[PDB]
Amino acid sequence: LPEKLQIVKPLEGSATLHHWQQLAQPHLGGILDPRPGVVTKGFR
C-alpha cells in the first residue's frame, strides 16, 4: 500500500463542504454582510 494513493472525500452528504460551496459563489449582495473572526489587509 504506498503513499501514491489519493484519498478522496466525496462532496455529497457533507455540511462543511456545502458551507464551502455556498461561500464560494460570487454575489454582489455581500456589501452589507459581516463575518466574525477574520481580519484582512485594509479592513474597515
Binding site: 460551496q21 454582489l28 489587509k41 474597515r44
Partner: protein
C-alpha cells in the same frame, strides 16, 4: 487555467493542526488522534472554477528536514498555526518559520502565507497583541483567521481562505503601500464601463445594472438592496450616485472597496467574464476564435451584426447629424488598444460635405474588412463586446460562409451580396475618376485631396431591380504581369483613353493574357469623353474588337460635370456580376 492547489500546514508540536483536518473530514471532534494525517484531497465540484485541492500535514517527529524542504518547495500556500494559550509559538513564528520558508525561496516570487490561531475556546476575551507587528513586518501575510475545532468555529472557512490565496490573487490588483489600485486594473475597468453603458450618457441606470448582474454574477439582486449599495457609495464619496445612478468613479470605488475588504472573487468574476486573464490582458480564444473557410468561398456578415453596428452608430452620434466627427470617432476607439482606421478610410467610403464618415460609409467600411481579412474583423468585434452584449457563444456567429463559385455557375443562381470588380488600365487615364465616381464626387471635389492619403479600394451600395447590394472596385496598377490574386474577381472594367491612341493596346493585351480563357464577363468603358476624341492607332477598331468578342458595346464616362456623376455604369457592372450566363442580348 490551473492544475492543482496544495495547502501545507506547519507549526509547533501540540497545537492541534492535525485535529483541524480530522474535524474537517469527520464533521465532529475526535478526542484521540494519530500524529499525522494523509493527503486528503477535495474534489473539483466544491468551487465553480473546478480546480482540485490537496491538503497535506507535517509533523516534526515523523518527518525529516530534507522532506520538509521538499514539501515547502512543492507548495502553493502555507498556513502557520499558533496557539493563543502559549507564548513560545508566537516567538517561533518570527524566529524560525517565516525565515525557514524564505530561506531557500528567491526574492522574485514568494508563496502567500496564512496565519492560524487555535485554542480560542480556552481564553475568554478575544484579543490580538503580538501578531500586529508581524503583519507590519512581512508583506506576505494577508489573512489572520482565528479558529477553534471544539466549537467548530470557522473550520470550513480556513481552507477556503487558503485556496483563495492561489485561485483569486490580490497581487496584480492591489498595491498595499500607496493604497490604490494598479493602473492595469484601472485601464481594465474603464473599458468594461463603456461596453455596459448602452446610451453614452456617462451613467449606469437600473436597467443596465441588472444586465450586468445577470451576465457576471448570475441570479440578480433584489430591488431593495441596490439602493443600499447606492447609499453607501453616496456616503463614502461625493461624486458617486448621479441622477440616473452610478458613474465611473462610483464603479471604481465599489470595486476598490470590494478589493480592500477582502471579497476578491466578485471583481475576478467580472474581469474573467469579459475576457481578461491573471495578467490583465485580453486572451486568445476570445480575440482569435477558429473559423473554417473552404476554398473559393467568401465571408459575409449576417443580419445580427447589422443591428449591433447600427446600434453602435446610434449610440455614439450625440449631436444626431447622421455623421461622425473626429471627436466622436475618437470616442468610438477608446475601447481599442490602437486606432484601427487611418486617414485612408475617409477617401475609401462615402462622406458628407466637410469630410466626415457617414452612415453608409460606416457600414461599408465594416463590409470591407470582413471580405479581405476576416480575422481582423473578429478581432475588432471582440473589443466592442459582441459576445457579451448579444448572448452568443463567440464572435464567429456573426460571419456566414456563402456558396462556391463553380456551383453558382453550374446552377445559374447566386445568393451573394458583395461583388468584387477589378479596374485594369493605363496610368494617367482617369482610373481614380472611375473609383471616385462610385462615391459621388466630381472633379472639383477630386482636386482637393492629398496624394499622401490616397486609396486603391472603393466600396458603395448599388440598387438594381429594387435590391440593394455592395460594389467594390480595386485599382490594379500597371505592372506588365499579374499574380493570382489579381485574376480572382467577378467582373472587370477595362478602361481606355480616348486621348491616347496607345491605351487600347495594353488593356486588350491584358485581355489576351489571363482573362479571355476563363468564363468571366467583362466590360469596356471610355474615359474623358469631355475632351476631343482622336482616332486610335490600333489595327482593329475598338468598337469592332469589342463587338467581336461577344461583349456589351462600350459606354461613355466623364467626370467633368458640375453635379454628381451618373450611376449607370456601376448598375450594369452589378447586373453582369449577378447573371454571367445572361448576355445583354438575352435580357
Amino acid at each position: 487555467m490551473k492544475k492543482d492547489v496544495r495547502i501545507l500546514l506547519v507549526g509547533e508540536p501540540r497545537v492541534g493542526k492535525t485535529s483541524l483536518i480530522m474535524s474537517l473530514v469527520s464533521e465532529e471532534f475526535p478526542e484521540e488522534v494519530p500524529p499525522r494525517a494523509e493527503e486528503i484531497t477535495i474534489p473539483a465540484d466544491v468551487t465553480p472554477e473546478r480546480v482540485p485541492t490537496h491538503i497535506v500535514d507535517y509533523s516534526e517527529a515523523e518527518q525529516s528536514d530534507e522532506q520538509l524542504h521538499q514539501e515547502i518547495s512543492q507548495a502553493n500556500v502555507i498556513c502557520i498555526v499558533y496557539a493563543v494559550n502559549n507564548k513560545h509559538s508566537i516567538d517561533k513564528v518570527t524566529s524560525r518559520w517565516i525565515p525557514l520558508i524564505n530561506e531557500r525561496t528567491d526574492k522574485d516570487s514568494r508563496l502567500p502565507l496564512i496565519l492560524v490561531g487555535n485554542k480560542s475556546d480556552l481564553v475568554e476575551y478575544s484579543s490580538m497583541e503580538t501578531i500586529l507587528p508581524i503583519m507590519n513586518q512581512y508583506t506576505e501575510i494577508e489573512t489572520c483567521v482565528e479558529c477553534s475545532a471544539k466549537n467548530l468555529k470557522n473550520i470550513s472557512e480556513l481552507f477556503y481562505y487558503a485556496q483563495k490565496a492561489v485561485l483569486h490573487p490580490t497581487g496584480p490588483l492591489y498595491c498595499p503601500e500607496e493604497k490604490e489600485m494598479k493602473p492595469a486594473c484601472i485601464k481594465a475597468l474603464t473599458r468594461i464601463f463603456k461596453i455596459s453603458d448602452q446610451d453614452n450618457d456617462g451613467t449606469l441606470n437600473d436597467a443596465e445594472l441588472n444586465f450586468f448582474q445577470r451576465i457576471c454574477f448570475n441570479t440578480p439582486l433584489a430591488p431593495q438592496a441596490l439602493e443600499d449599495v447606492k447609499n453607501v457609495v453616496r456616503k463614502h464619496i461625493s461624486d458617486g450616485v448621479a441622477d440616473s445612478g452610478l458613474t465611473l468613479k462610483g464603479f471604481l470605488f465599489l470595486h476598490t472597496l470590494f478589493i480592500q475588504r477582502g471579497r476578491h472573487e466578485t471583481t475576478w468574476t467580472v474581469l474573467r467574464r469579459f475576457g481578461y486573464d491573471d495578467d490583465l490582458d485580453l486572451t486568445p480564444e476570445y480575440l482569435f476564435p477558429l473559423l473554417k473557410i473552404p476554398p473559393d468561398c467568401t465571408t459575409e456578415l449576417n443580419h445580427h451584426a447589422y443591428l449591433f453596428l447600427q446600434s453602435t452608430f446610434d449610440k455614439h452620434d450625440l449631436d444626431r447629424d447622421c455623421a461622425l466627427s473626429p471627436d466622436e470617432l475618437k470616442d468610438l476607439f477608446k475601447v481599442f488598444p490602437y486606432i484601427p482606421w487611418g486617414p485612408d478610410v475617409n477617401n475609401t467610403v462615402c462622406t458628407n460635405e466637410r469630410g466626415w464618415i457617414t452612415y453608409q460609409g460606416f457600414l461599408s467600411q465594416w463590409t470591407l474588412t470582413t471580405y479581405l481579412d476576416v480575422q481582423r474583423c473578429l478581432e475588432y468585434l471582440g473589443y466592442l463586446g459582441y459576445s457579451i452584449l448579444t448572448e452568443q457563444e463567440s464572435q464567429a456567429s456573426a460571419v456566414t460562409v456563402t456558396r462556391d463559385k463553380k456551383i453558382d455557375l453550374q446552377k445559374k443562381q447566386t445568393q451573394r451580396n458583395v461583388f468584387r470588380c477589378n479596374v485594369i488600365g493605363v496610368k494617367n487615364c482617369g482610373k481614380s475618376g472611375v473609383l471616385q465616381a462610385l462615391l459621388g464626387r466630381n472633379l472639383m471635389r477630386q482636386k482637393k485631396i492629398r496624394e499622401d492619403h490616397k486609396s486603391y479600394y472603393a466600396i458603395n451600395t448599388v440598387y438594381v431591380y429594387g435590391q440593394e447590394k455592395y460594389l467594390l472596385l480595386h485599382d490594379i496598377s500597371e505592372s506588365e504581369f499579374l499574380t493570382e490574386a489579381e485574376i480572382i474577381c467577378d467582373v472587370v472594367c477595362l478602361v481606355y483613353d480616348v486621348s491616347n491612341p496607345k491605351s487600347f493596346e495594353y488593356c486588350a493585351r491584358i485581355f489576351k493574357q489571363h482573362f479571355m480563357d476563363s468564363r468571366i464577363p467583362c466590360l469596356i468603358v471610355a474615359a474623358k469623353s469631355d475632351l476631343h476624341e482622336v482616332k486610335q492607332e490600333y489595327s482593329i477598331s475598338p468598337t469592332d474588337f469589342c463587338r467581336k468578342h461577344k461583349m456589351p458595346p462600350p459606354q461613355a464616362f466623364t467626370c467633368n460635370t458640375a453635379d454628381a456623376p451618373s450611376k449607370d455604369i456601376f448598375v450594369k457592372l452589378t447586373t453582369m456580376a449577378m447573371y454571367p450566363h445572361v448576355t445583354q442580348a438575352d435580357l
